[PDB]
């Protein structure tokens, strides 16, 4: 009643975009350790019964194309949708291997009115990336 | 009708405007905690409560170490942005 229906035939897709190496133009150092994360995610969502699809070092163009095609799939038999983004970033922006791409442009493909098969279904986006250059020095307890 | 922006959940690794930390060998603080909390609670807690555990783990168990004072002894708190209309259970 107060919970999303999670008993469809399939739990849903889990798209993991793992960007480790960035073009020198971007000027971003390799994201060492991200492979460990991607593998950890794969195994974690596999146990949660998700159809995991991993992708590596995608350009901004490829990220958008991938998301576009995924939103166009028929999710009628899927309970939900999960997308994990591992890469460099800024506020409201995620980086492709060759450059940045607005997070909004990616999520719009899944809007309740642009992806009818997922309307009313939980769309989860896990973002591991910077959202600026502020440093939290914290406070002692 | 339902809003076109409804039923979305954005699980950010860090607060708006801040750096997100990653361990070159163990992986990013956020992803490590997330997978661990999901493995330990995905069969008993609702997702918002799981992510809260993730917030506490990242916030209390992690502190950066660097030869560069600028990135040394820093903290991080993940950011849960939810436009969901119902509770989410992975089992």
């Amino acid at each position: 009643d107060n919970s999303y229906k999670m008993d469809y035939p399939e739990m849903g897709l889990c798209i993991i975009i793992n960007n480790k190496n960035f073009h020198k133009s971007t000027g971003m150092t390799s994201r060492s350790g991200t492979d460990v994360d991607a593998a950890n995610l794969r195994e974690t969502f596999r146990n949660l019964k998700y159809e995991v699809r991993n992708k590596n070092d995608l350009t901004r163009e490829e990220i958008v194309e991938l998301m576009r095609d995924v939103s166009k799939e028929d999710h009628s038999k899927r309970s939900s949708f999960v997308c994990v983004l591992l890469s460099h970033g800024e506020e409201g922006i995620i980086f492709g291997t060759n450059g940045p791409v607005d997070l909004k442009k990616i999520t719009n493909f899944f809007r309740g009115d642009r992806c009818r098969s997922l309307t009313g279904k939980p769309k989860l986006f896990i973002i591991q990336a910077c959202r600026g250059t502020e440093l939290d020095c914290g406070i002692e307890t | 009708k339902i809003p076109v922006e409804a039923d979305f959940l954005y699980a950010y690794s860090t607060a708006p405007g801040y750096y997100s930390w990653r361990n070159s060998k163990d992986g990013s603080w956020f992803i490590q905690s997330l997978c661990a909390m999901l493995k330990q609670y995905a069969d008993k807690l609702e997702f918002m409560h799981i992510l809260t555990r993730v917030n506490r783990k990242v916030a209390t168990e992690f502190e950066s170490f660097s030869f560069d004072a600028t990135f040394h002894a820093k903290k991080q708190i993940p950011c849960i942005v939810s436009m969901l209309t119902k509770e989410l259970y992975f089992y």
Binding site: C130 | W21, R22, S64, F65, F71
Partner: peptide, 4 residues
């Protein structure tokens, strides 16, 4: 530790 490295920043993202």
């Amino acid at each position: 530790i490295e920043p993202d």
